[PDB]
Design a protein around this ligand. Structure first.
Ligand SMILES: Cc1ncc(COP(=O)(O)O)c(CNC[C@H]2O[C@H](O[C@H]3[C@@H](O)[C@H](O[C@@H]4[C@@H](O)[C@H](N)C[C@H](N)[C@H]4O[C@H]4O[C@H](CN)[C@@H](O)[C@H](O)[C@H]4N)O[C@@H]3CO)[C@H](N)[C@@H](O)[C@@H]2O)c1O
Ligand SMILES: Cc1ncc(COP(=O)(O)O)c(CNC[C@H]2O[C@H](O[C@H]3[C@@H](O)[C@H](O[C@@H]4[C@@H](O)[C@H](N)C[C@H](N)[C@H]4O[C@H]4O[C@H](CN)[C@@H](O)[C@H](O)[C@H]4N)O[C@@H]3CO)[C@H](N)[C@@H](O)[C@@H]2O)c1O
Lengths: 409, 409
């Protein structure tokens, strides 16, 4: 047991990481030779498909030395910056090595630029300790962060002294929050005169060429990552020159590493067209129509939140949830267990037909659960918490909100 | 000026980044078609040479999906962890995406494990704001870090209350600090009962197969990066299970990206032989004996600190330092300006012969500086501070130390 970290990855019945020896398009092969259709896709960072040939060629060329050097600037630096600025807007752009690094740098830059101490947060922003939970819910943690769990009532209370608040930083979820929720968030932040940071590490570049919340939030600062490089190790921040002036202090040794620049330039060129996002939505929607019908035909109490871009199974019980993923594993459908499923643009007709047949076999395996009590709100809240680390949107008062926080924290 | 960051990189006389189109071994091509011999080598992270064929082959292959997937575990994960453990020791290992990320995670883990608030630091640890300077010497910054600038007197002062100290965190320099300096540091930390973290992001794996301070410091926790992947986007931490237990909270989306694992596994295989490190030392030593002679023959007051693994020009005046790099720029010798020069294993006879020839021409160009006053200690201190962000070792009393800090901060 040499590894000190605990990486999120597909794990087997003994909680050991599944070992994958090969991948192409939508398909994985594991160490036993078992073949899987991938809905996890490095938690949605594989937008194009595994071993995408154009990205792979670009990386190959860059590995030889013929497309830039790690020692310094290249034309691919300008190309990537230009593309991000065109897609996502803002005045300036910075590049980082993980979503975690990017969101931390972004929010600290805003704290410095505004001179205000608190960050009000909803959703996951990466592994850094600055996001660890406070000792007392709804109080600042040691790094001045207060999590409001996507509850706008709580947010209103936290905005009551806006001079204390550097930014509101929110990781969107388009399965569990409506457009109106976003517009209200934007309204509240504008009224309070506080900066809005959209942490689009997951959703950026995937629902559209640009930011999912470009219009809904018009954020002052954005962060993207998973959509920009077909899995390669890069992230980005952009927004106003003034709010991001503190990023002038950022430099790191691997900045000019040419394979990541080549992958990002290639992937971003494809992203800019809108085609992979359309392909994903359409493929995912087809799979969903089939899956919803299969669950209904089998009288299985499993709803599906979301849409083809990202969806999530919502089973009525934890036992059923475990059985669902067990059956999926038996059929070679690799789902990101409990979380959101993000197909890639490699989900062609052949992949879809096979995923459909496999899912019908999943529903057969689930026959013991036929006719169970339908999904209720406690299940909806528990399942949504697993993907968003806070509360799905639905009517609540403070009693209900605080009850759910006590339950789900 | 879309870029919000200010990356360290080769820059021209107007402070514009030099744009490099391609590289091969020790050589670079710029956008003008000018051909350079590289002593910068992505600040010492290109140990093997640009476009190393064996690493390139492994990277190209991994990009196709033939060696596993970014979705989860592959046997190359085990191979990289096992190689690092064999080379560097400790009980556990973690992987990160930059040196900055690794050192931050390491020291926060130690602070959590020990329950103590302060970090005592010497040297550079990356770009994160946690390392920004305090208001005054000997005062903690906002993140509990106190800089001792490599001065063991200042360290003893800070260790008067060691119950406050989670760790001492040191970035070695083997040009400006002797073996005995390290052994004293180790001694002081052990007596005080404080954890010692060796930040070997720069020096790890380059002086020897493993840590440069394996015996000198026997650190509780180590960090490496530049040596491990021929420039690719990975770093590592290792050491005691107890002190690094808090790393269980680390996960990041690109963890399984197979090209980086491929580069690390290939580079580490070569590092484990000791061959590239020896080649570097021997090639740089040959260059240095030629350069020292050339400087002496021209009566130029420029010393050279260090050795073939890493060396540094120490000119008697700033005006001469500027002229030296300007002249090297004309002859196409790319030095990391002001800092340390780190040749790669691609510095062969052909390259050395040409670098020697080119350096002779640099000496011809600096005639207007012949016969100048020889290097003094003020120059030695100023130049060393540029590479270590603290004080070179030399006899000092407390008053001299205080004055030097006033001058150089
Ligand atoms: C908006 C945003 N911003 C920034 C980042 C960071 O980018 P990165 O640095 O490139 O990875 C991400 C990275 N995203 C990775 C995933 O992040 C979440 O996943 C998180 C978290 O929700 C999820 O937490 C688990 C929870 O849902 C389960 N119900 C309980 C489990 N113990 C817990 O585990 C995690 O937190 C534990 C507590 N500290 C920790 O011990 C576990 O090891 C850790 N896995 O674990 C993931 C990280 O490990 C999302 N739900 C997912 O859709 C997403 O794909 C991001 O989505
Ligand atoms: C031990 C160790 N630990 C961790 C890391 C982090 O690894 P990474 O995240 O992978 O890069 C490194 C990364 N190393 C990069 C370089 O780190 C230093 O270089 C630093 C710093 O010393 C150097 O500082 C400059 C100073 O030497 C000059 N005399 C004055 C200049 N303004 C200043 O510039 C830097 O610091 C400024 C302080 N605010 C900042 O404004 C500048 O923008 C910044 N470039 O700049 C570099 C980083 O930007 C070393 N001198 C070098 O040998 C080395 O190769 C490391 O060496």
């Amino acid at each position: 047991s040499l590894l000190a970290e605990f990486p999120t990855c597909p794990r087997d019945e003994k909680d050991r990481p599944r070992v994958f020896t090969a991948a192409s398009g939508a398909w994985l092969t594991d160490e036993s030779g078992f073949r899987w259709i991938d809905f996890d896709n490095a938690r949605g960072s594989i937008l194009l498909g595994h071993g995408d040939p154009v990205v792979a060629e670009a990386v190959a060329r860059a590995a030889t030395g013929a497309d830039g050097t790690a020692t310094g600037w290249s034309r691919r630096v300008d190309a990537v910056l230009e593309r991000l600025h065109a897609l996502c807007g803002g005045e300036v752009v910075g590049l980082f090595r993980s979503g975690t690094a990017a969101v931390r740098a972004a929010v600290l830059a805003v704290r410095e630029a505004t001179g205000r101490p608190l960050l009000l947060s909803a959703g996951y922003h990466g592994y850094d300790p600055m996001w660890y939970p406070s000792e007392a819910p709804l109080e600042p943690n040691a790094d001045g962060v207060v999590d409001f769990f996507f509850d706008l009532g709580l947010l209103r209370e936290l905005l009551r002294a806006p001079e204390r608040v550097a930014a509101v930083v929110v990781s969107p979820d388009h399965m569990h929050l409506s457009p109106g929720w976003y517009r209200e968030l934007r309204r509240l932040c504008s009224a309070a005169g506080v900066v809005l940071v959209a942490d689009e590490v997951k959703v950026g570049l995937r629902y559209a060429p640009g930011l999912s919340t470009a219009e809904l939030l018009a954020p002052d600062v954005w962060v993207v990552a998973k959509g920009m490089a077909n899995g390669h190790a890069v992230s980005a921040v952009g927004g106003s020159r003034r709010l991001l002036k503190p990023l002038k202090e950022v430099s790191f040794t691997s900045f000019f590493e040419p394979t990541i620049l080549a992958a990002a330039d290639a992937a971003l060129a494809r992203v800019a067209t809108g085609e992979p996002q359309r392909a994903v939505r359409e493929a995912g929607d087809r799979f969903l129509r089939h899956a919803r019908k299969a669950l209904d035909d089998a009288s299985l109490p499993v709803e599906i939140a979301g849409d083809g871009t990202f969806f999530q199974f919502v089973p009525a019980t934890e036992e059923l949830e475990e059985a669902l993923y067990g059956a999926a594993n038996a059929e070679g459908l690799l789902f990101y267990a409990g979380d959101n499923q993000g197909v890639s643009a490699a989900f062609d007709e052949a992949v879809l037909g096979e995923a459909e047949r496999r899912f019908a076999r999943v529903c057969e395996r689930l026959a013991p659960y036929a006719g169970g009590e339908p999904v209720g709100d406690a299940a909806r809240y528990r399942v949504a918490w697993n993907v968003m680390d806070g509360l799905r949107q639905a009517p609540r008062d403070r009693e209900e909100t605080t009850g759910l926080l006590a339950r789900l924290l």
